[PDB]
DNA sequence: TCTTGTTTACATTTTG
DNA sequence: CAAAATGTAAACAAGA
Protein backbone atom coordinates (compact mmCIF):
# COMPACT_ATOMS: atom_id res chain seq x y z
CA UNK A 1 0.00 0.00 0.00
CA UNK A 2 0.94 3.65 -0.72
CA UNK A 3 0.62 4.65 2.93
CA UNK A 4 2.73 3.87 5.97
CA UNK A 5 1.33 2.33 9.13
CA UNK A 6 0.72 5.24 11.53
CA UNK A 7 3.17 5.34 14.49
CA UNK A 8 0.34 4.80 16.97
CA UNK A 9 -0.47 1.49 18.65
CA UNK A 10 -4.06 0.22 18.63
CA UNK A 11 -4.30 1.24 22.27
CA UNK A 12 -3.15 4.76 21.40
CA UNK A 13 -5.58 4.96 18.49
CA UNK A 14 -8.53 3.85 20.61
CA UNK A 15 -7.48 6.14 23.46
CA UNK A 16 -7.17 9.23 21.26
CA UNK A 17 -10.54 8.52 19.65
CA UNK A 18 -12.39 8.20 22.96
CA UNK A 19 -10.79 11.23 24.60
CA UNK A 20 -11.44 13.54 21.68
CA UNK A 21 -15.07 12.38 21.56
CA UNK A 22 -17.69 14.76 23.04
CA UNK A 23 -19.10 12.17 25.46
CA UNK A 24 -15.71 10.66 26.31
CA UNK A 25 -17.06 7.40 24.91
CA UNK A 26 -17.59 5.75 21.51
CA UNK A 27 -19.19 2.71 19.92
CA UNK A 28 -17.19 0.05 18.09
CA UNK A 29 -18.17 1.35 14.64
CA UNK A 30 -17.39 4.89 15.78
CA UNK A 31 -13.86 3.81 16.70
CA UNK A 32 -13.58 2.00 13.35
CA UNK A 33 -14.73 5.10 11.50
CA UNK A 34 -12.45 7.45 13.45
CA UNK A 35 -9.33 5.46 12.58
CA UNK A 36 -10.27 5.02 8.91
CA UNK A 37 -11.23 8.68 8.46
CA UNK A 38 -7.82 9.83 9.65
CA UNK A 39 -5.57 7.05 8.45
CA UNK A 40 -6.01 5.75 4.87
CA UNK A 41 -3.70 2.87 5.79
CA UNK A 42 -6.59 1.30 7.71
CA UNK A 43 -8.90 1.45 4.70
CA UNK A 44 -7.55 -1.99 3.79
CA UNK A 45 -7.23 -5.31 5.65
CA UNK A 46 -10.20 -4.19 7.71
CA UNK A 47 -10.97 -7.81 8.53
CA UNK A 48 -7.59 -8.08 10.26
CA UNK A 49 -7.13 -4.92 12.30
CA UNK A 50 -10.77 -4.47 13.30
CA UNK A 51 -10.46 -7.94 14.81
CA UNK A 52 -7.32 -6.80 16.65
CA UNK A 53 -9.23 -3.70 17.77
CA UNK A 54 -12.06 -5.80 19.20
CA UNK A 55 -9.41 -7.95 20.86
CA UNK A 56 -7.67 -4.86 22.23
CA UNK A 57 -10.89 -3.63 23.86
CA UNK A 58 -11.63 -6.93 25.58
CA UNK A 59 -8.01 -7.64 26.52
CA UNK A 60 -7.00 -4.36 28.11
CA UNK A 61 -8.59 -3.44 31.44
CA UNK A 62 -8.28 0.25 30.61
CA UNK A 63 -11.33 -0.15 28.35
CA UNK A 64 -14.95 -0.25 29.52
CA UNK A 65 -17.83 -0.97 28.21
CA UNK A 66 -20.79 1.17 29.13
CA UNK A 67 -24.42 0.01 28.56
CA UNK A 68 -26.44 2.31 26.40
CA UNK A 69 -29.18 2.20 26.92
CA UNK A 70 -32.73 1.94 28.05
CA UNK A 71 -33.60 5.29 26.72
CA UNK A 72 -31.67 5.65 23.49
CA UNK A 73 -30.94 2.15 22.24
CA UNK A 74 -29.04 0.71 20.75
CA UNK A 75 -26.04 -0.52 18.91
CA UNK A 76 -23.45 -2.44 20.84
CA UNK A 77 -22.24 -0.64 23.91
CA UNK A 78 -20.20 2.51 24.34
CA UNK A 79 -16.50 2.12 25.07
CA UNK A 80 -14.78 4.60 27.37
CA UNK A 81 -11.67 4.99 29.53
CA UNK A 82 -11.04 3.81 33.08
CA UNK A 83 -10.28 6.81 35.31
CA UNK A 84 -7.01 5.01 36.00
CA UNK A 85 -5.08 6.82 33.32
C1' DT B 1 -27.31 -13.25 9.51
C1' DC B 2 -24.22 -10.06 10.65
C1' DT B 3 -21.93 -7.25 14.15
C1' DT B 4 -20.15 -7.05 18.66
C1' DG B 5 -17.59 -9.08 22.55
C1' DT B 6 -14.75 -12.70 24.87
C1' DT B 7 -11.32 -15.95 25.17
C1' DT B 8 -7.21 -18.87 23.76
C1' DA B 9 -3.10 -19.52 21.84
C1' DC B 10 0.92 -17.74 19.27
C1' DA B 11 3.29 -14.54 16.88
C1' DT B 12 5.76 -10.13 16.53
C1' DT B 13 7.54 -5.73 18.09
C1' DT B 14 9.17 -2.86 21.64
C1' DT B 15 12.13 -1.86 25.44
C1' DG B 16 15.02 -2.24 29.54
C1' DC C 1 19.05 -10.55 23.85
C1' DA C 2 14.75 -11.73 27.36
C1' DA C 3 10.80 -9.90 29.33
C1' DA C 4 6.97 -7.10 28.38
C1' DA C 5 3.58 -5.22 25.37
C1' DT C 6 1.14 -5.41 21.12
C1' DG C 7 -0.69 -7.81 17.29
C1' DT C 8 -2.83 -11.94 14.62
C1' DA C 9 -5.66 -15.63 14.04
C1' DA C 10 -9.76 -18.48 15.30
C1' DA C 11 -13.53 -20.13 17.63
C1' DC C 12 -17.82 -19.27 20.00
C1' DA C 13 -21.22 -16.39 22.43
C1' DA C 14 -24.49 -12.78 22.62
C1' DG C 15 -28.00 -9.63 20.80
C1' DA C 16 -30.25 -6.20 18.18
UniProtKB/Swiss-Prot annotation:
Disulfide bonds: none annotated. It comes from the Eukaryota. The modification Phosphoserine is found at residue 58. It is found in: Nucleus; Cytoplasm. Residues 5-85 bind DNA. Transcription factor that is involved in embryonic development, establishment of tissue-specific gene expression and regulation of gene expression in differentiated tissues. Is thought to act as a 'pioneer' factor opening the compacted chromatin for other proteins through interactions with nucleosomal core histones and thereby replacing linker histones at target enhancer and/or promoter sites. Binds DNA with the consensus sequence 5'-[AC]A[AT]T[AG]TT[GT][AG][CT]T[CT]-3'. In embryonic development is required for notochord formation. Binds DNA as a monomer. Binds TLE1. Interacts with FOXA1 and FOXA3. Interacts with PRKDC. Interacts with AKT1. Interacts with TET1; this interaction may recruit TET1 to specific genomic loci to mediate their demethylation. This is Hepatocyte nuclear factor 3-beta. It comes from Homo sapiens (Human). The lineage of its organism: Eukaryota, Metazoa, Chordata, Craniata, Vertebrata. The gene is FOXA2.
